[PDB]
Design a protein around this ligand. Structure first.
Ligand SMILES: O=P(O)(O)O[C@H]1[C@H](OP(=O)(O)O)[C@@H](OP(=O)(O)O)[C@H](OP(=O)(O)O)[C@@H](OP(=O)(O)O)[C@H]1OP(=O)(O)O
Ligand SMILES: O=P(O)(O)O[C@H]1[C@H](OP(=O)(O)O)[C@@H](OP(=O)(O)O)[C@H](OP(=O)(O)O)[C@@H](OP(=O)(O)O)[C@H]1OP(=O)(O)O
Length: 138
């Protein structure tokens, strides 16, 4: 409806890290009818309701199927995994006004069905990049 984003999660428990690989998106929704978009992807590491880190891909001008292939590493100790949320947002860069939200993804053990599945797959396959498509929720 708003597009899909393909990303992988790799949780290395001995290293206490989660690597987030923003791979690509497809069928992004444009602002106008028949127009284009300038998508970039934001990644926030959350602990409870507090932001721990923020990351950001480069922008892909005039591209509704952007390829990013960017990886971000986050430190997460075991005692905070249960309170961890990774929020991924596909944005639409606008030089004139405020950048619009295309879709958001909340990754944790207590999120939507597709998000919980991806999270559990990450937990169950430590040290493997688990990749999965996600519908973008407005
Ligand atoms: O000025 P922009 O290129 O549009 O980006 C800003 C900028 O983020 P970056 O500087 O990390 O690129 C803000 O951060 P500051 O420079 O003030 O530190 C950030 O604000 P917060 O990180 O404090 O949230 C804001 O994001 P927000 O939408 O949450 O206000 C974000 O704007 P975009 O996400 O729309 O690009
Ligand atoms: O949804 P996925 O499993 O990730 O695979 C898709 C899918 O490929 P298959 O349908 O053969 O699995 C697309 O195919 P169509 O829906 O068009 O039939 C294809 O798109 P194109 O063949 O039209 O190129 C795309 O390839 P790409 O994203 O490189 O354009 C490819 O993505 P994967 O690279 O993830 O296989």
């Amino acid at each position: 409806s708003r597009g899909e984003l393909l990303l992988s999660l790799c949780y290395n428990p001995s290293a206490n890290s989660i690597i987030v690989n923003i791979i690509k998106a497809r069928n992004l929704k444009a602002m106008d009818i028949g127009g284009t978009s300038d998508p970039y992807v934001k990644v926030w590491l959350m602990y409870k309701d507090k932001r721990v880190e923020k990351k950001k891909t480069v922008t892909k001008k005039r591209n509704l199927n952007p390829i990013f292939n960017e990886s971000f590493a986050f430190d997460i100790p075991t005692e905070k995994l249960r309170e961890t949320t990774i929020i991924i947002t596909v944005m639409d860069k606008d030089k004139l006004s405020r950048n619009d939200v295309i879709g958001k993804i909340y990754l944790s053990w207590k999120s939507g069905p597709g998000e919980v599945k991806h999270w559990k797959d990450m937990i169950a396959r430590p040290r493997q990049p688990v990749a999965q498509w996600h519908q973008l929720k407005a």
